[PDB]
Design a binder for this molecule. Structure first.
Ligand code: UR4
Length: 435
């Protein structure tokens, strides 16, 4: 696998031991051959699991998720997918890694797509080797891959709202259930309904993931209610998955706003990863997978692929050359390489709106490309009346940095800045000049 000019897709089934058995073997071989190597973890949780699998090997952990004293003699670096892309965008030297290893390489967050595009472009150039580790590479059509033990697959109507009757099979279960919901808000309603029925419920989402995931290890629980983030190598001691088979899809309308469309069907890859949370123990056959809809290729026209092009347009490769998306995912967006390339000062604004601002890529781009500077928040208040952000059926209000109470009315509306209470709170703080 380790010869230059090669990209290898390690597509062993979920639970086959890619992370705990194959990855340490690859790393040992890489060190033997003096390959400067990066290992990309999708999350801080997986980064910590990798440290356990790699413990004893000279690996530099570029994450505060691991508390290790580095020797200074490591040629293998480990960081999150997002950290890799972030360091590429920033005015900081990223080594030209000979070997690029991406774990959970199916991750469809913009920074992961961008990292695959950059890595696969370096391999196509003949400059590097890469290994993408995933049961479900782009365009996979099999929602029902092999497992370590037989799974009971049942198509069933799954609740997406509180219920009083008609779903006894949900609560009548005495094991542990991982339940994939399309959104935080939908999970909150299911979680309240299960809590009222006497169940112990943990909720996971992107913003709460590291903190709340620890509860699945430290306390007894009956249900984990999770968004799609648990597709990215989160492991549970569970005997059932309940899968809505639904997700939200960010969509750019008319080049001018972003909506969260759906809920709508998940991809085959997502369905296989959700299912793949169970059937992992060869000694425990008959884990159950209850699924509430079909799959569709809802990654086509999804904003994350256009966002990935915005990031790649702003990463230096060589002179004016721009990295392509990884070929199997390159048709998910109608975009021209270079269309989003910013001049030096606008690019810095774009980076800071994402890194410090915590704005979605698309929104960061609109503000930066309009020639607005990072601390200038006038745009949060001067949109049309129909861009008014609503909080519990009333216009959201903040005190501006000037001490004026104003209605939150952004010039560009991205539904992700108000998708749940936590998002809207963060965006209000941003509009107020608090970061
Ligand atoms: C599952 O097999 C049928 C199918 O693919 N149905 C879909 N429904 C959508 C959809 C749903 C909500 C909002 C917009 C679009 C996309 S695909």
């Amino acid at each position: 696998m380790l010869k230059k000019k090669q990209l290898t897709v390690l597509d062993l089934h979920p639970g086959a031991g890619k992370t705990r058995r194959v990855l340490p073997e690859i790393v040992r071989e890489a060190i033997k051959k003096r390959l400067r190597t990066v290992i990309l973890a999708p999350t801080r949780v997986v980064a910590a699991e990798m440290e356990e699998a790699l413990r004893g090997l000279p690996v530099r952990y570029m994450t505060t998720a691991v508390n290790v004293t580095h020797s200074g003699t490591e040629i293998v670096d480990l960081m999150c997918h997002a950290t890799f892309t972030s360091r590429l965008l920033q005015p900081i030297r990223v080594p030209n890694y000979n070997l690029n290893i991406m774990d959970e390489a199916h991750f469809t967050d913009p920074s992961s797509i961008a990292a695959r595009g950059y890595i696969s472009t370096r391999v196509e150039m003949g400059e590097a080797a890469a290994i993408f580790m995933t049961a479900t590479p782009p365009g996979t059509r099999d929602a029902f891959p092999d497992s370590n033990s037989p799974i009971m697959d049942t198509e069933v109507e799954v609740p997406e709202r509180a219920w009083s009757s008609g779903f006894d099979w949900v609560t009548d279960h005495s094991g542990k259930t991982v339940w994939f919901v399309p959104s935080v808000r939908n999970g909150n309603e299911i979680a309240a309904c299960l809590t009222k029925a006497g169940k112990r419920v943990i909720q996971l989402s992107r913003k709460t993931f590291e903190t709340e995931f620890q509860k699945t290890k430290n306390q007894e629980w009956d249900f984990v209610i999770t968004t799609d983030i648990s597709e990215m190598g989160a492991n549970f001691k569970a005997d059932r998955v309940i899968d809505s088979r639904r997700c939200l899809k960010p969509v750019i309308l008319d080049g001018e706003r972003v909506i969260l469309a759906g809920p709508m069907p998940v991809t085959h890859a997502s369905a296989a990863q959700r299912r793949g949370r169970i059937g992992r123990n060869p000694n425990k056959p008959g884990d159950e997978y209850m699924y509430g809809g079909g799959c569709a290729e809802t990654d086509e026209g999804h904003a994350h692929w256009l966002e990935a092009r915005m990031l790649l347009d702003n990463i230096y490769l060589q002179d004016g050359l721009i990295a392509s998306l990884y070929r199997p995912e390159a048709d998910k967006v109608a975009a021209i390489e270079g269309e989003f390339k910013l001049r030096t000062e606008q690019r810095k604004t774009f980076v800071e709106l994402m890194k410090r601002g915590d704005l979605p890529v698309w929104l960061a781009y609109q503000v930066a490309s309009a020639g607005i500077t990072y601390t200038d928040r006038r745009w949060c208040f001067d949109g049309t009346t129909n861009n008014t952000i609503m909080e519990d059926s009333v216009p959201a209000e903040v005190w501006t940095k000037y001490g004026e109470k104003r209605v939150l009315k952004p010039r560009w509306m991205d539904a992700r800045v108000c998708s749940d209470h936590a998002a809207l709170k963060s965006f209000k703080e941003f509009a107020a000049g608090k970061r």
